[PDB]
Every structure is written in C-alpha cells, then in structure tokens.
Design a binder for this molecule. Structure first.
Ligand SMILES: *[C@H]1O[C@H](CO)[C@@H](O)[C@H](O)[C@H]1NC(C)=O
Ligand SMILES: [Ca+2]
Ligand code: NA
Ligand code: NA
Lengths: 118, 36, 259
C-alpha cells in the first residue's frame, strides 16, 4: 500500500521516530534516554554538576535522579563526588558526572576502571 | 572487642571535646535530681 | 519530631539518615555505633504486610547531616551498605517487638566534627539512667505533626530536629495503649499535667534516644524510635526499642560478622 509509518503500531512511552518502512525507535525528551533493559521506556540522565530531578507531578515531591546523583535543594540532582567522599576507590580517583574513574595498580600502564573499586 | 566500654564514643568534637555545652543539655542533667 | 527545635551543628554526630534511592527520599533515621556499624529499627527495612523489604542497594547511608534536603558536600559522608542484619525474632506479626536492625558498612566512615559514634549502655549505665522522670533526647528529620489528614504545620523540617523527653514508668506506658508492651521496649514523653510536650513521629524511626551520663559525660543510646499511636497525643507516649535488653544480639552479630 506504500508507504507505512512503523510508528503507528509502536508503543513508546514518550515518542517514536521511524527508521525504515518496517522499523522504528522509541526515543525520549532531551535530558532522558531509553532504558537499556526497557527500550520503550525513558529515564533521566545528567552529565553536569546538577540537572533538575525527574519528579512525578501526580504525587507531590516524588523525584528520581540518575545513578551517581543525589537529590538536593530545589529538587535538583547533584553529582556525588566519590573521590572526595572516599570509600569508593582505594587507588587514584577521578570524579565524573554520574560515576567516577578508579585507577588501580601498582603495575605498569595501570587499569582505568569506571564506577568500580580495585 | 565491641561493647567493652573502652572505645572513644559519646563525646562530641564541637561540645565536650571543646568544653562547650549545647542549649538544652542542662535540662537532662537537671532531670537526674530526685525529690526526697 | 513534634514540638522539637533545630538541632545545633554537631549536636548529634551519631545521627544517621537512611536515604531511599528510588524515589529519592528520607526512609528513616539511624545511629553510628562504630566506624563500620549503624543501628536502626527493623520496621524501617522490613514489614511483610505492606510488602516492605529494602535491600543493601536500595539505600544510601548519610552521616554527618544537618539540613534535611541539602546535599552537604564535604560535610556529610555517604556510606555503602555491605549487609543488613534484621533481628531474627523481630515480631512484625503483632507488637513490633525487637524492632532492631544492624547495618555493616562496606568501608569505615571517617570521623570528624560532624561524624562520631555514640556509646551503647552497659549494665550499670542502663540501670542508673533508665528511670522514670529522667530525660533522654530524640532526634530526627521526620514529620513535625501527625499529618496524614488536616493539620497546620510545616510538614517536614528543613533541619534536624531535637526534643528532650522524660522516661515514663512502665505501668503508665502499659495503661496508655491496648497494644502489648514487652520488656524490649520502653516509652517516653510528657504527661498531660506537665504542660510541656513533644514526641517522635513518622520518619523518625531508627533515630536514637540518647542520655548524657552525669558520671563520665558521655552520651549513650538507650533506645531506638520504634512506634506509637499518632504523634504527640495526650495520654500517649512514644515507644522505643530498649537497646540494652538487645545488646547481647548486637554484640553477637558484630563479633561473628566482624567489626
Ligand atoms: C526479601 O528479600 C530479601 C533478599 O532480596 C531478604 O533479605 C528478605 O528476608 C526477604 N523478605 C521478605 C519478607 O520477602
Ligand atoms: Ca561523581
Ligand atoms: Na522522556
Ligand atoms: Na504529648
């Protein structure tokens, strides 16, 4: 019958963007990305010091923050500085927005691990 | 071991350690005085 | 905390905040009893009737906090939970008897002006301090009023709350409720004729009921905010988990599962 919009039969939480006449992709609003294990669903992300929390307006003050972030004043998700905090990395630690890099050795080259300790 | 009674616990850096008393600390101390 | 006041910076360095990751919210209070052990109430973590069952990865342990909402960077410290130990004989079926749980932290917390463990009472401390009329202290970030209906108040505090409450004689605690009271619990709070008031409330559970020793000037955790009926009602008293009575179990899991 050419051509079919694949999104007509899609069940995305937020939006749907067509790829082919047969395939599509469920996408999210800016600041959100599909959940890896739930591709039709969305979850907030942040790559800075802070980003507004994902709060549900159907229930007062129920907010979500991505991993590595913690709710702060003004319902904002702020980055947890695992290096300054301590206890997350015993080797050399570099803080990241959302996680941290832990360098472990004491051998040559040294392994750069993301989000895990030595 | 734990619970031996030798550990350094119960002393606040900003209070007992500096010989400073908090606002209502006296109230608890005054409750110990029993009426004969 | 109902009828309390703003805690001073460093007033309760042992006060711990159990924080739920999803959604991001206060779960309950707790206490630091060593550099790797945290004490709280069992009902905060497990209550089958409501299908409540929080595991190590569902929470964050926040030590050294003052403000309820602010992320106190470089002041507060976040500790990861290695293992939660709920008392095997915790009676969620009826009384909430033995409402107690231990949490071993993955790494030892760094002591500071805002972080420092409270002492646990020994036999003598418990006998000398745990007497009717003697005042203890309760702290927490819980509700400022019984809420959950109509009520004029700020709801949740902006800063850690503190209240001084006197221990009540056992028979008066017994006659105030129809719920069976065990020796693993004690009640505290003012009587109607005293005028002064105050009480723990929702969200305060797990927080410590401490007493300062007139002998050695150290603070001891005599109780854990466990339960009550409403909050700050006349003729009602907050019920606390008797720490000394369960000290044998505390010492058992800490010795077996290491310090
Ligand atoms: C729930 O599961 C956890 C393990 O994920 C276990 O520790 C706990 O005892 C269980 N409790 C109930 C009531 O299912
Ligand atoms: Ca980080
Ligand atoms: Na979205
Ligand atoms: Na009252």
């Amino acid at each position: 019958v050419e051509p079919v919009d694949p999104c007509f039969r899609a069940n995305c939480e937020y939006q749907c963007q067509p790829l082919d006449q047969t395939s599509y992709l469920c996408v999210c609003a800016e600041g959100f990305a599909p959940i890896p294990h739930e591709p039709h669903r969305c979850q907030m992300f942040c790559n800075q010091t802070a980003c507004p929390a994902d709060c549900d307006p159907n229930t007062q003050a129920s907010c979500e923050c991505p991993e590595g972030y913690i709710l702060d004043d003004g319902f904002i998700c702020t980055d947890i500085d695992e290096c300054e905090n301590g206890g997350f990395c015993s080797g050399v630690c570099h803080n990241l927005p959302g996680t941290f890099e832990c360098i472990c050795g004491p051998d040559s080259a040294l392994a750069g691990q993301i989000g895990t300790d030595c | 071991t734990f619970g031996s009674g030798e550990a350094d616990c119960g002393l606040r850096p900003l209070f007992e350690k500096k010989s400073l008393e908090d606002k209502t600390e006296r109230e608890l101390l005054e409750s110990y005085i029993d009426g004969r | 905390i109902v009828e309390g006041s703003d805690a001073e910076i460093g007033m309760s360095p042992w006060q711990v905040m159990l924080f739920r990751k999803s959604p991001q919210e206060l779960l309950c209070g707790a206490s630091l009893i060593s550099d790797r052990w945290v004490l709280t109430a069992a009902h905060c973590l497990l209550y089958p009737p409501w299908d409540k069952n929080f595991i190590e990865n569902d929470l964050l342990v926040r030590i050294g906090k003052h403000s309820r909402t602010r992320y106190e960077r470089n002041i507060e410290k976040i500790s990861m939970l290695e293992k939660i130990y709920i008392h095997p004989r915790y009676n969620w079926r009826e009384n909430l008897d033995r409402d107690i749980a231990l949490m071993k932290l993955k790494k030892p917390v760094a002591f500071s002006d805002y972080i420092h463990p409270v002492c646990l009472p020994d036999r003598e401390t418990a006998a000398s301090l745990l007497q009717a009329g003697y005042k203890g202290r309760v702290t927490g970030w819980g509700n400022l009023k019984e809420t959950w209906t109509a009520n004029v108040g700020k709801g949740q505090p902006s800063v850690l709350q503190v209240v001084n409450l006197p221990i009540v004689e056992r028979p008066v605690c017994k006659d105030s409720t129809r719920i069976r009271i065990t020796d693993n619990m004690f009640c505290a709070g003012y009587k109607p004729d005293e005028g002064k008031r105050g009480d723990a409330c929702e969200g305060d559970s797990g927080g410590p009921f401490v007493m300062k020793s007139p002998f050695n000037n150290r603070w001891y955790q005599m109780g854990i905010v466990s339960w009550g009926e409403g909050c700050d009602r006349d003729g009602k008293y907050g019920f606390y988990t008797h720490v000394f009575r369960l000290k044998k179990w505390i010492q058992k899991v800490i010795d077996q599962f290491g310090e």
